[PDB]
């Protein structure tokens, strides 16, 4: 029971599967698409201190990954290199075949130390971390991501109607993910 949205003549209605209204035509698996949308486009604050408050560490929950075929250009991506005060890794290395988000104008690369009190870092509002055509529930080390969400569509029969430079800004942080956190941008 996941909302499947069907595009009508230049309009979008969420197709109700319980009833059966046949005027929708799905003649091939090519009409089915998944799309990732950026949270930025909904007006959330993009400042680094505001953004980092949305993430938190937790133990006991296995991570999960789901693919998507088409995405949005991101204005802001993030890249985290956080260590414990003794010097240890609190973010796991990227698994094989998880690369960074392809298109973002700005990559905020944050380095520093924190308590990292949990096995994995999750999104406190339940959104996803988008990478190159894979969305994960957790943050991987040294891998640029965008915040986003996934939708599923039945595209119309006609193909035609539907479907580069980067900059890095560096920060040093102490007390990352805590009530009072110290940032210095270089």
């Amino acid at each position, epitope marked *: 029971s996941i909302p499947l949205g069907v595009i009508h003549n230049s309009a979008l209605q969420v197709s109700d599967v319980d009833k059966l209204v046949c005027r929708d035509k799905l003649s091939s698996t090519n009409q089915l698409r998944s799309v990732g949308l950026n949270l930025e486009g909904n007006g959330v604050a993009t400042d680094v201190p505001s953004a980092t408050k949305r993430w938190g*560490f937790r133990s006991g929950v296995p991570p999960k990954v789901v693919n998507y075929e088409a995405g949005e250009w991101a204005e802001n991506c993030y890249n985290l290199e956080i*260590k*414990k*005060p*003794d*010097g240890s890794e609190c973010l796991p290395a990227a698994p094989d075949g998880i690369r960074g988000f392809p298109r973002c104008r700005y990559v905020h690369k944050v*380095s520093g*130390t*924190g*308590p*990292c*009190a949990g096995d994995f870092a999750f999104h406190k509002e339940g959104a996803f971390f988008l990478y190159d055509r894979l969305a994960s529930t957790v943050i991987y080390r040294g891998t640029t991501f965008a915040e986003g969400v996934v939708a599923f569509l039945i595209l119309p029969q006609a193909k035609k109607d539907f479907f580069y430079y980067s900059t890095t800004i560096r920060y040093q942080a*102490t*007390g990352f993910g*805590t*009530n*009072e956190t*110290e940032y210095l941008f270089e």
Partner: antibody
Framework: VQLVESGGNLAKPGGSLRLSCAAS????????MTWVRQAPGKGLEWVGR??????????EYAAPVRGRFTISRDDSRSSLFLQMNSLKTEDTAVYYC????????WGQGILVTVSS | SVLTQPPSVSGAPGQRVAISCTGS?????????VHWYQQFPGAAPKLLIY???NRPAGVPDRFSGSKSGSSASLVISGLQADDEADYYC????????????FGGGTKLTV
């Protein structure tokens, strides 16, 4: 894992003394290193810490000792150096150089007695 | 922003004792590890409990620990003559630029 600390002794007020620590049996380059000073017959204290070269090799110091003590390291020599300058009164203590937890393995200790 | 322990504790041989180390919201209750150390007179301290409850190889199983709220407690059961030592708790403060904090220390007597 053997840590030996050397080259330290009493210094006059306003003096500069340099201490050194030699580490063996483990890879010095990766590990973060810290310096602790214990007052004679009193509780432990933290002098400061030096990060790895890979992480930028930044150093941080305690609030009392900030601006008077310098921490450094040499990967090839596998040695850690502490530079004490402008040594005033109440700096007397045993100094130790300790590895990153787990297996902290504190060294033996160098006694520094400022004499007036 | 200094962790505080009791000046001294005592107990008869064979019983169990617990040593307390008080914390703060930005110290222990912020989620930083607490380390314990044992110092014999005239010697450098040795690691006792590297994490909140972990033990490095070679430490007898008489020593354990637990965290409650913003405070940590070291539990030692079965006092022997050899347990006389100075115990210190250590943690990382988050309001002090992630600088190490050392407890006042506790002397043990049997």
């Amino acid at each position: 894992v053997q840590l030996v600390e050397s080259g330290g002794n009493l210094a006059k007020p306003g003096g500069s003394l340099r201490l050194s620590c030699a580490a063996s049996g483990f890879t010095f380059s990766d590990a973060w290193m810290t310096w602790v000073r214990q007052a004679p017959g009193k509780g432990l204290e933290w002098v400061g810490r030096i990060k790895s070269n890979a992480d930028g090799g930044a150093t941080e110091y305690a609030a009392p000792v900030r601006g008077r003590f310098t921490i450094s390291r040499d990967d090839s020599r596998s040695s850690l150096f502490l530079q004490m300058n402008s040594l005033k009164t109440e700096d007397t203590a045993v100094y130790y150089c300790l590895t990153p937890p787990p297996r902290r393995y504190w060294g033996q200790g160098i006694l520094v007695t400022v004499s007036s | 922003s200094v962790l505080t322990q009791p000046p001294s504790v005592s107990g008869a041989p064979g019983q169990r004792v617990a040593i307390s180390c008080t914390g703060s919201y930005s110290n222990i209750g912020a989620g930083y590890d607490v380390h314990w150390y044992q110092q014999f007179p005239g010697a450098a301290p040795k690691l006792l409990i590297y994490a909140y409850t972990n033990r490095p190889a070679g430490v007898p199983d008489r020593f354990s620990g637990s965290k409650s709220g913003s405070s940590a407690s070291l539990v030692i059961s079965g006092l022997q003559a050899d347990d006389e030592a100075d115990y210190y708790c250590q943690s990382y403060d988050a309001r002090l630029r992630d600088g190490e904090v050392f407890g006042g220390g506790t002397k043990l007597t049997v």
